[PDB]
Amino acid sequence: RHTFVVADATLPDCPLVYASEGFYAMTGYGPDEVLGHNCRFLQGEGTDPKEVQKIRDAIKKGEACSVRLLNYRKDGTPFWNLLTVTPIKTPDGRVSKFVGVQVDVTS
Ligand SMILES: *[C@@]12=NC3=[C]C([C])=C([C])[C]=C3N([C][C]([O])[C]([O])[C]([O])[C]OP([O])([O])=O)C1=NC(=O)[N]C2=O
């Protein structure tokens, strides 16, 4: 059971351009609130800054990354999000998109 998003890396702050139905249903946010925005709006007080930094660095370097994140739904309730980000390059080496699989691992 997982969800999927696509971020545009040709815009400087990796906005989300596509989300699976599960992503909206899991987070409680609609397309009007999700599309065109950076995924970080799902972070909040308890989100570990040291893991957040791991994703920031991997995205800046165009590498894949996998981190465990405390995230929050629109109603404020938290959940554990095993997040894996994969860079999608054009044949000329440049990163065009990032894709993400998000798993609620609260169990
Ligand atoms: C988010 N999923 C997610 C999916 C993709 C494809 C990408 C590129 C990023 C995310 N993020 C995080 C956010 O966009 C950003 O990369 C990090 O917050 C670190 O950068 P900053 O500048 O903020 O330090 C996701 N973040 C979440 O919290 N939940 C996800 O599902």
Q: What is the stated resolution of the deposited model, in angstroms?
A: 2.5
**Residues sharing a CB contact under 8 Å with residue 103, sequence separation 6 or more, in sequence order:** 1, 2, 3, 81, 82, 83
| Ligand 1 center to 17 CA (angstroms) | 13
53 belongs to an annotated ligand binding site: no
Does the Cβ of 55 fall within 6 Å of ligand 1? yes
Query: How far is residue 24's CA from residue 37's CA, in Å, rounded to a whole number?
Result: 14
Does the Cβ of 52 fall within 6 Å of ligand 1? yes
38 belongs to an annotated ligand binding site: yes
CATH superfamily of 3-104: PAS domain (3.30.450.20)
Cβ–Cβ under 8 Å, residues 25 and 64: no
4 belongs to an annotated ligand binding site: no
Query: How far is residue 61's CA from residue 73's CA, in Å, rounded to a whole number?
Result: 29
Solving technique for this entry? X-ray
For every residue of the chain, DSSP letters joined together read: --EEEEEETTSTT--EEEE-HHHHHHH---HHHHTTS-GGGG--TT--HHHHHHHHHHHHHT--EEEEEEEE-TTS-EEEEEEEEEEEE-TTS-EEEEEEEEEE---
Residue ranges covered by each domain of the chain:
3-104
Other beta carbons within 10 angstroms of residue 3's beta carbon come to 20
- CA dihedral (94, 6, 37, 69) positive or negative: negative
